[model samples]
Target: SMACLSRIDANLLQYYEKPEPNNTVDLYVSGSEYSNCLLLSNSEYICYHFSSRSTLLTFYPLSDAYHGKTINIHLPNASMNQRYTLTIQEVEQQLLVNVILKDGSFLTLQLPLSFLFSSANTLNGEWFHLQNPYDFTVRVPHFLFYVSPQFSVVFLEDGGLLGLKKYLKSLTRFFSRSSDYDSVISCKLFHERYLIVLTQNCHLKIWDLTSFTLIQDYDMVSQSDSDPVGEYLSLYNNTLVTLLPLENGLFQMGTTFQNNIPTNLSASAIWSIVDLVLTRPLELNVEASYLNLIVLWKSGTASKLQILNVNDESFKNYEWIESVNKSLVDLQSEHDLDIVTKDVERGFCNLKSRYGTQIFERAQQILSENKIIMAHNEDEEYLANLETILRDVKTAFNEASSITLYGDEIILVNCFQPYNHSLYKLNTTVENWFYNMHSEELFKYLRTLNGFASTLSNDVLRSISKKFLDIITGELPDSMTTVEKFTDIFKNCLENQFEITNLKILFDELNSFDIPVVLNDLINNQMKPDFISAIKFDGFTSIISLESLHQLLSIHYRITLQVLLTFVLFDLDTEIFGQHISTLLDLHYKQFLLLNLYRQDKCLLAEVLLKDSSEFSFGVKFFNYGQLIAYIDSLNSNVYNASITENSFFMTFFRSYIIE
Candidate 1:
């Protein structure tokens, strides 16, 4: 009931004329006198001007950032002393302009709305040559419909390059008029699947393409009881808006949809309707639907007429519904952010299965057992056998240690270190293997044998378990026990130890390792921290004090016991473990702590550090902001710098210190 026509105070009149010093010719008289003016879906106005020597197209923005600006396209070639049609259609989210001359040859121009407003002094369009001219043509996203002079409609697929040349080769007939129907005046593709065609005698007909059935036919002459000339016909969604001029000098704006009778709005005789566009339908209540019509008249007037449902009961609560919907959307976005924050926190705290203490203990046990057996044996053969095992054991140990050292360097470079020059690069061969080699290939294989203690059933799982035990232990037959089994077990144990040790180093580095003095020097030299595989003895040492390590163990024990009671656990697959290990090393302690604390709303802790406090002994002055800034700066210098650079946590922390 509240629906009414309201004139929007948009001065589109200024855009109708050529701007400034180029005003030698009236744009409306020279440019749009022969061609049609268009209002694009993107809300930009387009008009064309043609001459014997060239053609001009002008663009004007209505409700975009390019307000008060104009973009013009100039084409060098033009048709002289001939009637040409200028048609613009928005199809498949693109604006297509077609200029058809009397000779049937047409130029198709595509204009990118954004680029048209922002850049480009001139635009280029493609031209197609046809042998015969059609009376009218309509272009959709996939098909082009042409109305031939014989009152028959032909359609062709607008396929890409392959179908470009095929349009001239053949034509497919879509619809042939009956004696009662008049010549097709305008056509539009409705709902992408149906064709809506208007006849010159003010008749509307819709055809279903899938079934080839004539679905709807309406006579505007019978509805109005007068000879009304159809000016514009457009269908958006299910609603259709039509503009027709009645004999009584009134412009009728008619709108109708399924099951609803046509509603008409009459305009003054002085105003002639040129184009009509419809806004998307809005359902304010379950029983009512509303729509808005945008009318562009020949007098350069643009106005919106709202069609409201008279029986809408929800109109009183409209503001409340709008506010509630907005709040719901905002809450959903915040909920998503919370989920991501939790994920980051869980990832930061996750400990890999290969990092278990049992792995490293098993390796040390093997080494100690071999060394003890070598010392006790007196036989030369036994000693040589011991030497062989010892040689392999040492090699495996060194290789494992190298990988562990690499992991440690990754942690140090990402978290504690800020100096790039002092960092050591891995050997080319080692680096290649470390990054490229699959983790499964890094370990040795083992087999099982012997009947051992009594008999075992053929239970599949139990049988597999027994075989695995024999492989890890030296319980194989005498022949299999010589070098292969022992060497394989030793190598496998060493690899396990390497993974565990690397995990330990990562934990230690993230938690306790202080920034190095050399980092400051490197920062002064304008260098940043990076990963290196070269070993550093100091880094290898247990930097976490014995007491701190004990405290961590107690904390972990409590956590494990609580988790065991709560949910009941959870791979030592080396490749998977390596992936997790690398991911952890790629992160920084500062970023983790910052995000973790901020998500927990620990702003008070940061506030306490910033605020003055006499009892704390240390205040903001002792925080070493200069060193921290330099360290952060060095991190920001590199693209591969730790996770500390991009997040809001880091920015907030840095801002607090600087502002203070």
Candidate 2:
């Protein structure tokens, strides 16, 4: 019972790890900061290794590095995934690195930076912390721990396995000794538990913090100078390259950092930089897959750029190496321009090359080729081209979307007429195009509606219809808005049709008067060629202009339609006579209801337009005027004793019948 209560710390828990085949991946550098980053997924830890030519998104297993055979899996440059900014944060139970891609979407990776005692600082650099399967804490100097406290966890340096005061006291005792391994020359956290402590003595020790186990100790020769040999060390696939300074303004590299053995290649044999003094400090890094070494150092009076590939064994071929160098050819735009600037005009050019419109030219080129086929012709070629355009236009209209109705209207208008400035411009372009292409057919159709009745005098009918046909055939002035042109047509047509009904009534009156003189006088005033010229069409201009061109009718058809409707109202057996006229009417009857009539008027009016679609069809009968008058005054109706002259409407229609 007592042995069962003796709880074992998770630190003593033994776990077996099977070595994996060395699967390698090359990551191209997106920038300096994340050139050394790694991607962590559910079952794998992927290193994001940046090469000169290739940036790879990879899930390279950390265990694979221990084995001799390494395999690299390359990721595709989808272009979008290649551009992103990495944000590291101190989240609860995790060190979170959020990758925000250029499109504002993001991916998150959660894991550790090093082994069990792996250390990471807060964004503000306030608290240095680490994590493991069990809750863990680490101790470091005050300067390295606290940067800013706001966006960090406050490191409570007191109260631990040893009390806070006792812990500091022990550390002070250790510091007071005169020893060669004094300062922390280098410290790296790996394997979550493998904390590599390198001292000034060039001595190293790997400590498993969880188990409190010291792996071993060994000595590696390095300069005794307190300053760093080089400011960078990168470890990938068990290959560590440290860039260190040598004698007489020269720098050297090609050293491997591993636990069991040390391998150092001579500088002159591998890589070296000479005759340089740090204007500031040097920036140095290495690609994880042993692809290339990056050094950023400025000498007094100038700057320099150099790339060296000391090892080709890791690369697939020389062709891939050339590709890598090509990608790195684009220096920072401002830097490439020899100016220290950001996001300049050339930078945007670079942006487009990297991330701008990829498919715009392809799409525009296809349309341009199609547009070249639109020529004035009468053959099937013209019809085929026109059909393609029609399909595209319909698709444009159907797929059109916008935040505002005005934008949608612009899209709809542009579908009909490309690049139209305003609604009027869009309509006029259509009118001009239609008029230009179909004037012959349009006017020939117009001539069919020239004369509908024998009652209307020739001068009156010709005055109204001829003027319209002639004017429409005349030059279309660019100065006039399309609305005015359409207005002129409709005005002439409406007046022409309205006059037929007037002429019909006049004949009825002449029959009763039996006066030949009255008929001559009526011809002079009503049926003369001056009838249209005498009346100003100012009112109709405003009505026609304010409405959209889509909501308008062909001037000839609309005028004739108004005449047909009115004559039908006056007497039911009226005819609108023409050979091809009925077919034209049938073709546009649906269009008329949609455009001409308001929504509420469609049901009743549509019934009327479809009723007489034949070439020569009588209008359905209207009520007799006797019934109309009776309905106005019958006792059984709403009004029986109503005065006909009470409203001006009744008085005007029945003026001649009213006795003086």
- Give the TM-score (vs. native) of candidate 2: 0.22
User: What would the per-residue lDDT of candidate 1 be over residues 16-113, giving only the tens digit for each residue?
Assistant: 11112121222220112233334556534343333342355554432221233344455444422222244456655455655433333445556666
**Model 1 misses residue 241 by how many Å?**
3.8
- Scanning candidate 1 in windows of ten residues, the lowest lDDT window is 414-423
Give candidate 2 regions above 4 Å deviation.
Answer: 1-173, 177-182, 189-193, 199-205, 210-219, 223-231, 248-660
Model 2's alpha-carbon lDDT is 0.27
| lDDT (tens digit, per residue) of candidate 2 on 364-483 | 345577674434434445444433443343233222110111111110111111111111112222123223333332222222233334334444443433333322224335365334
Give me the candidate number with maximum lDDT.
1
> What does each candidate score in C-alpha RMSD?
32.3, 34.0
Error of 2 at 396 (Å): 45
Task: Give Cα distance to truth, residue 508, candidate 2, Å.
Answer: 99
How does each model score on lDDT? 0.31, 0.27
Clashing pairs in 1: none
